[PDB]
């Protein structure tokens, strides 16, 4: 990995730095690192690989070095230097492209490719130079099992769920009490319903939990937490948990009352936010424990009395929202987010050629799946061709 | 179920639509059309309960499902109703003048009661929440109350002389006495004619609908008076005729039974839930 | 408050006991008994129901939390035993010649009953199942059946001359009638005095207890003949006096109430599944 | 630990092999391995034990070599390392019980005790050589993060766990349909239990169905099968899921019908046995899904239809079952098992010296509590801790 990573950083390197005027004390070192790795690469064969429809491709280097005795480069030593990055740059790519296409269920932290296992020999390792990237960074920290962080700008970390639970309920759907959610992404809207607005209910008050337990821990999470919840605000015909039938949902806001958000590591509380809403910091958590209460007005104008009548029928439920949106966390494990490009890249080498689902990844590298069942098989797979799609990036 | 009531149940909010499950409700349920007298006199046939049943078989439901009883009129009715099938229609033949009357039976047979003895001759009793009501039934139900004070003596009336008691309710086959709440009454009913019982409205009874035949929407199934619930089994109709009542009961039929919903029928056929 | 809806129950195998509820029950629950008036009668005792009330308040009972009810005897109590009480023990004379009306009394309060209208004239009924049963009520039930091939013509009964269908019940105040299953049956009911009621035997009804006073083992609550289940809701002791009948209910009744429990189908658990 | 290891392994071959009479040959590469130690620790002071009742140490090596000039090995040569070797003996003891008794949150799988700490300096690293035991192999093979493997005998992955759940039941508790299992150790007893016989079952066949999620991954694993739950084969008085009241349990036994075995990978088939009965082979699996089915006996005898009426009362309560034993599997993580020691040696030693309750693991290293909440950071200090027990158990 980190030869592969190496040569794509010469390769990248070489094509911003080999440019027509400049001084040769500006690349020495650069064209240093680029002959020996035409030293080290010459005469040697690689075959890319056949699986799916990426086709086999066979590689064969002979080239010479590039000059050292000019003062200033000139167009004939850009182009010169740029057939032999054209070449290289094909090769990376189709080596990037072969090791993600690739999964194991045993060392899926290794080269699966036939290219990425030769390079990982010992004659190759004197192309290693500068690893500066964020993911080829965390490679190095992980196989010395160093404390690692991916940083993550709306981390992809709840599997897409819109799920509600009744707490009373009955045959007409009439009198319902319970809560709705959707967990997308890195947002959670949920909102709790009463019916009756808690008319019966011990001090008029209802009491609503969610708990969301994220299959990985979040440490130095930025956190917004909006009273309501407007996924939930408005008229819905909502199926049945058996599918039976279909209820109608008629909500009217009310502000959640007694909010606390909770941020929990192993059960253990971290963070605690009691009626706040800006801004909330989660410094290192695996648990959101979300509490909102419906509190009946104890003092309504005409209009608000009439929406809620003493018994049934019940016309205007009382809702309770809330929303929260991790804008911002650091993961030890590689994470889907709105900014990076991996998960794309890796699901679109996988569809363009056509892979056939392999014994790690769910079908499609579809998210949900990956994120529901993460496990660490799933997590050094992962990580592997997260890696490998940042150094195919560098390039392609 | 019931060590599982209290648990919650979470349904997805994608879960794939079931087919229609009318023609399955009506294979397995049964239909009760209640009427009254002068309809089967105005309809003048012996065979009208077969065509009827027929027709509802043209519907879907099964020969032996749809049932038909008969009631003198809205007062008569009133004494111990008695709900039979899963489905209780009720065409309620309208009166400018039986409005009260008809608003308790609709109160009555469209919310479920959990009624308890009284024993007025003994004990002084009180309506503890705006739940909590009085349910008289007989042939004549006379009710008079006597209101206290926390001293037990009345006021605007005396204990001994039942004279001077507040009438609430005379010449009555169902009546719903609402009194202020917290105040102890004494009660003078006619014993004899009439059993009151102390009930406590639970909630709505979704297997019985009440189509009222004619006037305008006068029923008030609520005490409260700052309300008065239209609900989708409270129907009105206008009608010259009653086969043509009875041909739109039978050919709405999929949208009554809609409007009402199943498992809401009693081992008992009772009107209330009467617990000792 | 998930009503309507079964959910698994969960529980550990090392889960603490609660303490006793027995004392708490009897505090809040009421116990009706119900004996013949020749037993009444017997006694002579004008203050026996209270001299038992005081007895049962020795026992944990509250004052006034046991009824103590009347019936002439076993045909008339037959006729529509409504039991309300949330406890209910059944005092039943022996009769040799009764035993099977004795068997259908069990059988009517025993077990629990889904019954619809059956109206004969107009339909015919099958017995779909094992549990469905037509029970008849009234003051005097005669039923005469003509079983219908798939023709509809009657086998062995002519459906014009009901003089031919075979009989079944004769002057009864309750009967059980089973039929053969999968027969479509023309019904002959003196209707005017006896009402029958298609019903479906749901399952025991735990929260009354039969007492056979004399006697030997005879009751039989299942039309199976290949069962006759002793359950232990159904007592039997030897007599020679009443008092002393009454005396060993009043001592035993802890016994007498761990074979029973509440009503299921009541209570607020069992809400939109039938009742309540 | 390597170093630890090194220690206690060079100790153990001096115990086994500086033996009376015997070839210096024998030992030569032995005597230059102790002679090693023996330099590097020289003028090193070390001090164990200051957490419990553990008491406080102080060790200081001044000691000589051993000679090289003998050709066989005599009395006076055996008593001078004797002497040596029993100091060292006694040194590594302290120093594995000082490391067994301590626990860490954030980094639970570096070293906790001041000697251990010291010992991880660089001017130990000489001591270092043959790594040979499985725990250690897993350790080395873990710090580089390649896969590691322990292999068990009866793994205990399952927490303790008898309990029920019933599906269909009454306040009288004589109609019941549900499911009875213990999950204890290596074993899963589960039990379906009908007390109709499926009269009313549609097709007279009621599904039973019965879900265990492994805290772990288990690889190469060894199931034996048996028809039978014996354990929920006999008549019982078993308390309400409230404990309000007790209801019984007369089971008559029928054996399992369509038994469907499945061992899942992430919600996947990996492994299904249908009507297989006796060992098989669970290569890769997190879940056990066992399904089976009481089949009402479409023919019967007299007894036999005696035993199951049409209706109530059921006096017979038709039970299928099925036993599911884990005889050995391979985890890439510490189990305790029933072969092996390491659990015993650390709950041993913290209850010997009464180690206060930490914030890793449970009070008394309570098993079943530890295997329950299996977090990442209590598997880094379990694996720490166990592989200190197992380098202590080589020489006490
Ligand atoms: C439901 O309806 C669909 C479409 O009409 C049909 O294919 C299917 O068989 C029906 N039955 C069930 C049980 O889904
Ligand atoms: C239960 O019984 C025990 C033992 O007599 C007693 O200590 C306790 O107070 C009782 N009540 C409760 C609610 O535990
Ligand atoms: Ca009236
Ligand atoms: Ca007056
Ligand atoms: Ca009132
Ligand atoms: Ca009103
Ligand atoms: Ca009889
Ligand atoms: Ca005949
Ligand atoms: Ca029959
Ligand atoms: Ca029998
Ligand atoms: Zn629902
Ligand atoms: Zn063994
Ligand atoms: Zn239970």
Redesign the interface.
């Known amino acids: 990995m980190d030869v592969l990573y190496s040569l794509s950083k010469t390769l990248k390197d070489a094509r911003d730095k080999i440019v027509e005027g400049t001084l040769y004390s500006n690349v020495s070192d650069l064209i240093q690192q680029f002959n020996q790795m035409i030293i080290t690469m010459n005469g040697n064969e690689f075959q890319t690989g056949g699986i799916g429809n990426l086709p086999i491709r066979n590689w064969n280097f002979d080239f010479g070095l590039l000059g050292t005795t000019l003062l200033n480069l000139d167009a004939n030593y850009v182009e010169t230097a740029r057939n032999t990055i054209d070449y290289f740059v094909d090769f990376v790519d189709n080596v990037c492209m072969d090791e993600m296409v690739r999964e194991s269920q045993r060392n899926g932290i290794a080269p699966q490719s036939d290219s990425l296992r030769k390079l990982s020999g010992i004659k190759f390792k004197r192309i290693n130079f500068d690893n500066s990237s964020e993911y080829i960074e965390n490679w190095n920290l992980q196989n010395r099992r160093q404390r690692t962080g991916f940083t993550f700008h709306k981390p992809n970390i709840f599997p897409y769920?819109?799920?509600?639970?009744?707490?009373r309920?009955q045959?007409?759907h009439?009198?319902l009490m319970?809560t709705?959610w959707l967990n997308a992404g890195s947002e959670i809207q949920v909102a709790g319903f009463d019916y009756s607005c808690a008319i019966n209910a011990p001090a008029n008050i209802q009491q609503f939990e969610h708990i969301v337990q994220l299959r990985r821990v979040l440490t130095t999470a930025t956190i917004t937490l909006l009273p309501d919840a407007e996924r939930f605000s408005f008229p819905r015909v909502?199926?049945?948990?058996?599918?039976?039938?279909?209820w109608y949902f008629n909500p009217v806001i009310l502000r959640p009352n007694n909010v606390e958000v909770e941020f929990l590591l192993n059960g253990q509380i971290i963070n605690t936010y009691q009626a706040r809403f800006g801004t909330i910091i989660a410094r290192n958590f695996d648990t959101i424990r979300l509490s909102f209460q419906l509190m009946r007005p104890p003092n309504m104008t005409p209009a608000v009395a009439?929406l809620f009548?003493?018994?049934?029928?019940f016309e205007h439920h009382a809702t309770v929202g809330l929303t929260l949106r991790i804008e911002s966390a650091v993961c030890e494990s590689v994470l889907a987010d709105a900014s990076k490009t991996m998960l794309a890249n890796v699901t679109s080498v996988r569809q363009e050629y056509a892979i056939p689902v392999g014994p790690v990844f769910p079908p499609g590298m579809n998210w949900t799946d990956l994120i529901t069942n993460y496990s660490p098989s799933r997590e050094d797979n992962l990580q592997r061709v997260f890696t490998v799609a940042s150094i195919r990036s560098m390039l392609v | 179920?019931?060590?599982?009531?209290?648990?919650?149940?979470?349904?997805?909010?994608?879960?794939?639509?079931?087919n229609s499950?009318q023609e399955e409700t009506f294979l397995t349920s049964?239909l009760?059309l209640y009427y009254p007298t002068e309809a089967a006199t105005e309809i003048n046939d012996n065979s009208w309960?077969?065509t009827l049943?027929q027709l509802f078989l043209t519907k879907g439901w099964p020969?032996?499902s749809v049932?038909?009883?008969e009631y003198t009129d809205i007062a008569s009715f009133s004494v111990d109703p008695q709900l039979?099938?899963?489905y209780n229609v009720v065409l309620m033949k309208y009166d400018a003048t039986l409005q009260l009357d008809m608003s308790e039976l609709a109160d009555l047979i469209l919310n479920?009661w959990?009624c308890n003895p009284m024993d007025i001759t003994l004990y002084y009793y009180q309506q503890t929440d705006?739940?909590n009501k009085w349910i008289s039934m007989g042939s004549s139900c006379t009710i008079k109350v006597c209101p206290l004070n926390t001293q037990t003596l009345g006021i605007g009336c005396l204990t001994t002389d039942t004279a001077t008691f507040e009438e609430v309710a005379t010449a009555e086959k169902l009546v719903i006495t609402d009194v202020v709440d917290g105040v102890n009454h004494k009660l003078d009913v006619t014993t004899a004619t009439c059993t009151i019982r102390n009930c406590k409205?639970?909630?709505?009874r979704?297997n019985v609908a009440v189509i009222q035949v004619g006037g305008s929407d006068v029923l008030d199934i609520?005490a409260?008076p700052?309300?008065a619930?239209q609900?989708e089994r409270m129907m009105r109709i206008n009608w010259k005729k009653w086969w043509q009542v009875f041909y739109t009961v039978v050919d709405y039929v999929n949208q009554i039974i809609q409007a009402m919903?199943?498992?809401?029928?009693?081992?008992?056929?009772a009107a209330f839930?009467?617990?000792?």
């Open positions: 769920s819109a799920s509600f639970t009744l707490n309920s045959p007409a009439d009198n319970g709705m909502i199926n049945s948990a058996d599918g039976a039938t279909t009439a009548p003493n018994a049934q029928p | 179920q019931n060590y599982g009531i209290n648990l919650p149940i979470t349904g997805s909010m994608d879960t794939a639509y079931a499950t049964t009760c309960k077969d049943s020969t032996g049932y038909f009883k039979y099938c899963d479920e959990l705006e739940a409205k639970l909630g709505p979704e609520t409260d700052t309300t619930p609900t919903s199943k498992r809401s029928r009693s081992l008992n056929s839930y009467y617990r000792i």
